[PDB]
Design a protein around this ligand. Structure first.
Ligand SMILES: Cc1cc2nc3c(=O)[nH]c(=O)nc-3n(C[C@H](O)[C@H](O)[C@H](O)COP(=O)(O)OP(=O)(O)OC[C@H]3O[C@@H](n4cnc5c(N)ncnc54)[C@H](O)[C@@H]3O)c2cc1C
Ligand SMILES: Cc1cc2nc3c(=O)[nH]c(=O)nc-3n(C[C@H](O)[C@H](O)[C@H](O)COP(=O)(O)OP(=O)(O)OC[C@H]3O[C@@H](n4cnc5c(N)ncnc54)[C@H](O)[C@@H]3O)c2cc1C
Ligand code: NA
Ligand code: NA
Lengths: 431, 430
């Protein structure tokens, strides 16, 4: 397929992937970016919180990345003159009994006493692993390598749930992803992980992308349908018909399919599994740990847990924002509880967000790769979290891959690691 | 070099011992050791406590499975366990609340320097993927404060370079790598492992495995390559060998060597060292009043002058009671390296005097050049001075020499251990 310059190209979905694709495609082509909600970024949302220090753009979805893991995102932020800061992944885990806890800052707690030897063995086994087990599950490994049910549900499951989704079948996800998160110091039982945050919310780089695009962006304009035709492609958005030569989808595969209007498409876009996530921005200081109230990530398992019913019981993850270095002078509590099990005072709740995260079982990964088939067929292209590897870097680099295929080359060839990532994703996507 | 040859090993530290142990296979080896034990820098001193006798690591104590694969397999095969001893660091300076640590964000120095600690980590991480300059030159060219240089950079580097060392003159890549690999960090404790029951445990085993091939308290006096073979003068006796392997520091190697070739002085002279004094004591007045929970505690004495900063050195204490096996103990276990202030003689268990090599790019360039005199006049060189830094660097150079003498790398199966060996063998130019 040959795509001429100055073509009319639409971008459906304006999250991180859409926005990057739209922004690079604004060079070379005439682009329009359709976004259902009142802002750019989607999972990258920074909610304004009023405080004594000013207005804070509090990250409720996407929060963390770093310069090793996310090179392209890092250069992008740099060039936009956006600073990053270190937000170490300090973790404290609370369970029902007296002193029934553990943390990655000190060696205190009954669970630490009960489990230290397994935390220690785990780190060794994880590190020796990347160097069978090709697509294995973390749960299968734990069982086959004699780890206690206590480690499985009191250590493994909570740590995995500091992201990776609480509702998610965390113990079923790919072994290599856990082995890598541990070797790369993203998760650890002995130290806080090396995580970075963007200066003045993650939205900062999107807010710039938004200005740079200007009139090309349609906020509050949900697409209703994308109909490829003999002539070109027809987009029905915000009660109007639009004529384009190409259409780029940066929406979740389920949304992509509902908007697309062949049953090869139903095969490749249907069956994509998701996990509900509820981010709750609140100020109810009763969620803070009485012993670990100084750690960034605080996990709490409610009363009547019962280790035998462990698959049924679920804990809640709170994020102590006041522990973030920019929020040090701020006097008002800033908490984020994901999927709260116990109650959260409605009087103290700033806002709630309801999102869906893709599952990461090797089958889901196998599904993603297969999309290479419908790429650049009937003037359609697919990018986003569902077409790429996990994380923000994965999403925004996927948008870069599609933009590159439409004659806008990778913006940072100079940056060796950023070029390597792009080469990786382009290869993963089969584009 | 034919099999069943008579080979001597001068120096019985980690490198010697590993080389001797692998060379016991294929050849008839003798291991000469000046001191009463095997290991040298790897020393574990017995300390009596209510819970038991502890083999307290006073020299070499840190490694991990990523950094030290060969050392790790060696320990495993000998049935020796390892534990996590995170590199928690607290830095104390003369004023009120004039400190910083890698566990929390408290302290005046933390307030004064947070932005630079943060910038540093980014710059370090982006660097190996981008420099034969010093850490000091980099710091200066990249606008870092003299406060950062002497109150943050210099103390953190102290953990393994020694409070004395012109640490700021050491190569940049060594710092860039120590930071990217989470060995040193201003935001988290480093992933460091310790051997269970002291580091000596693996040496104590090689000692048994060698038996009568080991000659302790037998300092070599001279190594004279002859027309016939080589002649070793050790403990007032003449010994006849076909090959001689030196696992002693280059300065010691030269003093022992008697060759009449100027080149030897060129390659072995000019090697720079740094004195280190390890002090195993129980004087709790060395613990930080604020950071007494961190593993590595640095203290700069009163009258520090930021302008005279090159002249003043601080002292590094190691809070052993923070180690997980030492958690039930009730007697303080401290190790102060190069104490500036007075340490109570009533509370001093023992002292050790050692010398560490300098790691300026010139020193690194010297090490590589030794490839010239290797396997000449029936002599071979291994050790800390012929290899990259650390215990792995040391024992793997002993393995490289053993492999050159027909004893192949013992762990080809272990992919990372094979890769390290391939690396060192290449670095050494052997
Ligand atoms: C709670 C949460 C926390 C996360 N934390 C991290 C983290 O710290 N780091 C990290 O790297 N990743 C994290 N992620 C993963 C995240 O999904 C990705 O990082 C990335 O943001 C996904 O980008 P995306 O644009 O493909 O998806 P989305 O962000 O979901 O973008 C899709 C967009 O399409 C829009 N859209 C939907 N329907 C229509 C329509 N009809 N017409 C037009 N537009 C439409 C949506 O409104 C949305 O803006 C997190 C995700 C969640 C949900
Ligand atoms: C205080 C200190 C702490 C350290 N901590 C660490 C750490 O945590 N981790 C790490 O990886 N590295 C550490 N090191 C670095 C250390 O030098 C190496 O890890 C390694 O132990 C060096 O091995 P080596 O055998 O080459 O040198 P050495 O250990 O010094 O061995 C040389 C041996 O030669 C002997 N010898 C000297 N003269 C003669 C003679 N005339 N005849 C015969 N034998 C002789 C000596 O007695 C000694 O046993 C530390 C070093 C010191 C001094
Ligand atoms: Na600690
Ligand atoms: Na912290």
């Amino acid at each position: 397929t040959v795509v001429e310059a100055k073509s009319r190209i639409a971008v459906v979905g304006g999250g991180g992937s859409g926005s990057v694709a739209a922004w690079l495609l604004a060079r070379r082509h005439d682009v329009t970016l359709f976004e259902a909600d009142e802002y750019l970024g989607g999972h990258a949302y920074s909610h304004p919180v009023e405080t004594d220090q000013g207005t804070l753009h509090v990250d409720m979805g996407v929060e963390h990345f770093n310069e090793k893991l996310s090179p392209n995102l890092f250069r992008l932020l740099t060039d936009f003159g956006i600073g990053t800061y270190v937000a170490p992944s300090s973790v404290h885990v609370d369970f029902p009994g007296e002193q029934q806890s553990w943390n990655n800052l000190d060696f205190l707690g009954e669970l630490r006493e009960e489990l230290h030897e397994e935390f220690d063995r785990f780190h060794q086994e994880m590190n020796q692993l990347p160097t069978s087990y090709k697509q294995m599950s973390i749960g299968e490994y734990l069982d086959k390598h004699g780890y206690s049910k206590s480690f499985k549900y009191k250590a493994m499951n909570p740590i995995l749930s500091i992201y990776s989704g609480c509702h998610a079948p965390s113990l079923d996800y790919n072994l290599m992803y856990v082995a890598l998160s541990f070797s790369m110091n993203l998760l650890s039982f002995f130290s806080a992980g090396y995580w970075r945050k963007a200066q003045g919310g993650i939205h900062s780089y999107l807010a710039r992308i938004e200005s740079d695009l200007g009139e090309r962006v349609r906020l509050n304009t949900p697409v209703e349908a994308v109909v490829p035709t003999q002539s070109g492609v027809t987009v029905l958005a915000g009660g109007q018909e639009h004529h384009f030569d190409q259409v780029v989808f940066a929406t979740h595969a389920d949304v992509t399919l509902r908007l697309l209007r062949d049953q090869q498409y139903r095969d490749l876009l249907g069956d994509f599994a998701y996990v509900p996530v509820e981010s709750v921005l609140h100020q109810d200081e009763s969620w803070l740990s009485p012993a670990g109230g100084g750690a960034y990530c605080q996990f709490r398992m409610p009363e009547g847990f019962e280790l035998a019913r462990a698959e049924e019981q679920m804990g809640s993850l709170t994020r102590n924002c006041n522990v973030l270095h920019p929020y040090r002078k701020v006097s008002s509590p800033i908490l984020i509880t994901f999927d709260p099990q116990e109650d959260v005072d409605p009087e103290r709740v700033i806002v709630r967000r309801e999102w869906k995260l893709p599952q990461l079982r090797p089958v889901d990964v196998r599904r993603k790769k297969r999309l290479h088939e419908i790429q650049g067929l009937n003037g359609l292209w697919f990018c986003g979290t569902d077409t790429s590897v996990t994380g923000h870097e994965g999403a925004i680099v996927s948008g870069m891959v599609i933009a590159d295929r439409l004659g806008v080359p990778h913006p940072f060839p100079d940056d060796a690691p950023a070029a390597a990532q792009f080469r990786g994703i382009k290869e993963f996507m089969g584009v």
